[PDB]
Design a binder for these strands. Structure first.
Ligand SMILES: [Mg+2]
Length: 810
RNA sequence: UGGAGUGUUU
């Protein structure tokens, strides 16, 4: 029910000086005051609500508030550093906004609470059990009140349109540069977390031009013909749900709920005439008579806004995309690459950008922050980290080599798989054009693939038993039926694909869920031109797909948790961007290495973070563990990815109980110790080497193994940061781990070391990964269920029995 | 789809 306290502080690893983007806050012990604001209408946007409260405090300067500068959260929560003359008596007041008839707003104020700040600092010293959230969020409201007025808020972030501060991405989208801000508690002090942030937005422009950027028109006049049944639906997918503003009447905002089939010249709506009889009138005709405006593009469709039942249709030429709309739809591959290139900063560069943000923010001169008597240190918090020692990786073959990770990396030169697979029969299914992928390309691809295979301990015996061409979606299952039907011991089928093709999704649906054949796809370009490293990495994926063991942790280097049988679980849920369902995935370890993992997946409610069917999922994973090892886990280690702090209790409640439920349903008195660990990549905590000498790579990031659990972590609970991976490009994201439950009384060191070692068991690469393999595999499983496409959906994701005990998701 | 890591009133 309640997260355990920090047991101790880790001492493993060599110290290292670090700086964090957490800026110390000096907070007075005063007693701040809380008021509620019932604003009528109660639906108004936060943005208007802030204007209301703005003029409301200006208008009633002498009556109510005098000279005090209160802070407003945008909804109905006002704070003051001094008591107001309200005196707990509800006071109904009036507010008038300079409108277009002007607007009138009814506002009422009342004292509701007496937030104590001294009650926070003691909680920061472990004095109290928990930390009061209402006081933390009260400070947050103070620190972001001014940013929320002068910038565009987006979650905890702030953006604007200064000097462009954006790069184009195509398709009507651009990436804006802003900054994140949050108030967070730590031991003995409150911290202000500041970071740069960049998110994708829809360019503000006329919809006509949006229709050009979407689709692909160098100029609208090139399409003087009603949009095809294809251009129309693509455009519908992009603009649906976006805000638009009128540019002809008297601006005015609307939400697009659909795009009409007909053009404006023929799209009609019922118009009631003076006499009371209703008649059908075209949008073009109505814009002629009413607004005296001949549509320039009457052959184009209309934007239906408002309720889908009502018939509010707007021509494209009178609408603009409203500025400041965060793009929440999936970005095209080319769009994300542009965003990645545009937003990647080295560690030293990002550190400076944060320092610049602090200078321009100048919190120590913000009137509202000064009003509440708060101070924000200008220097980054100093932290001592620890570089945990990596584990040794044991290989096999004849040289059974022991690799030693260096800066989060190692290779397989002069090393072979731990238990490699001997492969005799295997087919090639080249779905790419023979012209680009000629028989010479296949022969040399094969030739060099077998050379790399035998060098790694996975010898590919002889030539492929089969090698033919094909194309089309419907050509897979018939050919796959044949392949299994006519080849004894068919182990692996290599598939060649051009670029982004729908053959991949169905090649997996058939090989994973229907016939159950291990498949390995590979792009055409990686056939015409082959590299040893690419061939080597390719071999990692296919050895495990056939039950191999690429390597294992050096057994004697493991933490004592491996004394008794133990199962490691990873859990993740991937959500769509209304009818699409969420996909829950839970994987479990099936040996003591731990290397092999069995997967469970479920389709559940749209955007439900809670794993609904977790108990059933855990149950079958425990059975498979018993069937694979003939042991019953004495401990269950549960790595749960992607849960914000605001959902710890909800997930802890349902999912911790579900795990317990699966144990006792198997066996009344089976009570293994559970450890529940939330793993989070989606945060803005950033660590930088204080000494240049400790920087790693061209990015200058902290080294793999860097661990922090002292000054920026929870004042009482069991949490820590572990940057287990090597920063390649940009600035490393240190993974955060929060222990919500622990029956096994883990020490700080053993859990940190265990977590670190688990990041070295990821079989797809000879590198330490940013999260433990179980959590990573869980993400891959759910991703694979997406390519697999309520009763029918569950079976589209249900996996074939033969491929129910292998690592098909690799 | 070799891989990791980097940003997310009509
Ligand atoms: Mg997730």
């Amino acid at each position: 029910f309640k997260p355990p306290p920090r047991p101790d502080f880790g001492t493993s690893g060599r110290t290292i000086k670090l700086q964090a983007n957490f800026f110390e806050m000096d907070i007075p012990k005063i007693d701040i005051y809380h008021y509620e604001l019932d604003i009528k209408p109660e639906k108004c946007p936060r943005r208007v609500n802030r204007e209301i409260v703005e003029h409301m405090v200006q208008h009633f300067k002498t009556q109510i508030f005098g000279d005090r500068k209160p802070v407003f959260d945008g909804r109905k929560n006002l704070y003051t550093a001094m008591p107001l003359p309200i005196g707990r008596d509800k006071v109904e007041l009036e507010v008038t906004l300079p409108g277009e008839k002007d607007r009138i707003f009814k506002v009422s104020i009342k004292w509701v609470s007496c937030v104590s700040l001294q009650a926070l600092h003691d909680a920061l010293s472990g004095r109290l059990p928990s930390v009061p959230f209402e006081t933390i969020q009260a400070l947050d409201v103070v620190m972001r009140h001014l940013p929320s007025m002068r910038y565009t808020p987006v979650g905890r972030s702030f953006f604007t349109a200064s000097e462009g501060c954006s790069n184009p991405l195509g398709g009507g989208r651009e990436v804006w540069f802003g900054f994140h801000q949050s108030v967070r508690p730590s031991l003995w002090k409150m911290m202000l977390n500041i970071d740069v942030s960049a998110t994708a937005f829809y360019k503000a422009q006329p919809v006509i031009e949006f229709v050009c950027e979407v689709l692909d028109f160098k100029s609208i006049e090139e399409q003087q013909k009603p949009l095809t049944d294809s251009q129309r639906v693509k455009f519908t997918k992009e603009i649906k749900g976006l805000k638009v503003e009128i540019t002809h009447c008297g601006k005015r905002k609307y939400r697009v709920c659909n795009v009409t089939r007909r053009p404006a010249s023929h799209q009609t709506f019922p118009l009631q005439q003076e006499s009371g009889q209703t008649v059908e009138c075209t949008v073009a005709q109505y814009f002629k008579d009413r607004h005296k405006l001949v549509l320039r593009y009457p052959h184009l469709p209309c934007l239906q806004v408002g309720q889908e039942q009502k018939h509010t249709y707007l021509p494209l030429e009178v609408c603009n995309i409203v500025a400041g709309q965060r793009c929440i739809k999936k970005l095209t591959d080319n769009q994300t690459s542009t965003m990645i290139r545009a937003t990647a900063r080295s560690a030293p560069d990002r550190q400076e950008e944060i320092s610049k943000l602090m200078r321009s923010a100048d919190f120590n001169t913000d009137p509202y922050v000064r009003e509440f008597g708060i101070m924000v240190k200008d220097e980054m918090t100093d932290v001592t980290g620890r570089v945990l020692q990596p584990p040794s990786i044991l290989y096999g073959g004849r040289n059974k080599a022991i690799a030693t990770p260096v800066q989060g990396v190692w290779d397989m030169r002069n090393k072979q798989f731990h238990t490699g697979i001997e492969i005799k029969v295997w087919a090639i299914a080249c779905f790419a054009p023979q012209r680009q992928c000629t028989e010479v390309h296949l022969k040399s691809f094969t030739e060099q693939l077998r050379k790399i295979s035998r060098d790694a301990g996975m010898p590919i015996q002889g030539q492929p038993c089969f090698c033919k061409y094909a194309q089309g979606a419907d050509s897979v299952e018939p050919m796959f039926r044949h392949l299994k039907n006519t080849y004894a011991g068919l182990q692996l089928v290599v598939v060649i694909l051009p670029g982004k093709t729908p053959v991949y999704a169905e090649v997996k649906r058939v090989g994973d869920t229907v016939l159950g054949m291990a498949t390995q796809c590979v792009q055409m370009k990686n056939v015409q031109r082959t590299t040893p490293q690419t061939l080597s990495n390719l071999c990692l994926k296919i050895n495990v797909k056939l039950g191999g063991v690429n390597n294992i942790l050096l057994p004697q280097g493991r933490p004592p948790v491996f004394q008794q049988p133990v199962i490691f679980l990873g859990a993740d849920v991937t959500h769509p961007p209304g009818k699409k369902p969420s996909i829950a995935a839970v994987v479990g370890s099936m040996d003591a290495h731990p290397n092999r993992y069995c997967a469970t997946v479920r389709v559940q409610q749209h955007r439900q973070e809670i794993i609904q069917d977790l108990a059933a999922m855990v149950r079958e994973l425990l059975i498979q563990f018993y069937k694979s090892t003939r042991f019953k886990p004495t401990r269950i280690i549960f790595y749960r990815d992607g849960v914000s702090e605001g959902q710890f209790q909800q997930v802890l409640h349902h999912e911790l109980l579900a795990i317990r439920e699966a144990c006792i349903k198997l066996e009344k008195d089976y009570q293994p110790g559970i450890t529940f660990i939330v793993v989070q990549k989606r945060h803005h905590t950033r660590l930088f080497c204080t000494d240049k000498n400790e920087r790693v790579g061209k990015s200058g990031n902290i080294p793999a193994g860097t661990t922090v659990d002292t000054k920026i972590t929870h004042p009482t609970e069991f949490d820590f940061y572990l940057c287990s991976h090597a920063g390649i490009q940009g600035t490393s994201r240190p993974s955060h781990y929060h222990v919500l439950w622990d029956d096994n009384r883990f020490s700080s060191d053993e859990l940190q070391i265990l977590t670190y070692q688990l990041c070295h068991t990821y079989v797809r690469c000879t590198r330490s990964v940013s999260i433990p393999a179980p959590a990573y595999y869980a993400h891959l499983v759910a991703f694979r269920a997406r390519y697999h496409l309520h009763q029918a959906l569950a079976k589209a994701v249900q996996v074939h029995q033969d491929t129910l005990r292998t690592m098909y998701f690799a």
